[PDB]
């Protein structure tokens, strides 16, 4: 399922730098109406045209309320254009790989070597989180929030 954020639909316009090499960042967040479950390709936010992540800070509230929680979040780039409500869209494990932020609601940063090696594209790609493993007891209305530090005009 696709749980679309404000930025993915386009109601909130994401910031894009003007100077080359400048660092910009807007926190991409949602308010989960329901309890997350495996397969939800949450389209948290969008990476603008010519940008590469330089640092990604992922913070969530306590997304599981069960002993030995299993919920894990994978953050990556998605294939199709932004805002297309088509289930045939796949996430990635680039920014984060089987991270365990949601077990205790902590904050972790990009700790994968592949995070900063993302290559450029010419069109607006969408950064979306996928719950690889379903939680033991899903939470009703907690918030998942990314923070992307992307730079334009890198060589």
């Amino acid at each position: 399922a696709l749980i679309q954020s404000d930025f993915a639909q386009g109601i909130r316009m994401t910031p894009v730098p003007d100077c080359a090499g400048d660092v910009t960042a807007c926190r991409f967040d949602i308010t989960l109406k329901n309890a997350p479950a495996a397969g939800d390709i949450i389209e948290l936010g969008v990476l603008p045209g010519n940008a590469v992540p330089v640092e990604a800070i992922l913070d969530v509230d306590d997304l599981d309320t069960g002993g030995a929680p299993t919920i894990t979040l994978d953050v990556g780039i998605m294939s199709g254009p932004v805002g297309k409500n088509d289930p045939a869209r796949t996430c990635g494990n680039e920014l984060f790989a089987a991270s365990t932020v949601g077990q205790a609601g902590g904050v972790v940063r990009a700790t994968a070597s592949s995070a900063f090696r993302i290559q450029k594209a010419e069109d607006h790609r969408s950064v979306g989180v996928k719950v690889a493993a379903g939680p033991a007891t899903g939470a009703a209305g907690k918030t998942i929030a990314l923070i992307l530090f992307y730079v334009q005009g890198t060589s």
Partner: protein
């Protein structure tokens, strides 16, 4: 964001060149200089069966 027409988007116009590149004909050695009905011509022409 900022508007981008991208490269593979269906809104990126393309233009076709009207003028064609061609393979120039291989220059033929036996041009009209040689093939002549006169005697002094390398490749004589026999005109017997043209009208008969």
């Amino acid at each position: 964001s900022s508007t981008v027409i991208a490269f593979g988007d269906p809104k990126a116009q393309k233009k076709w060149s009207s003028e064609l590149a061609v393979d120039i004909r291989k220059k033929s050695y036996f041009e009209s200089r040689f093939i002549g009905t006169s005697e002094n011509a390398v490749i004589q022409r026999k005109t017997e069966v043209e009208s008969d």
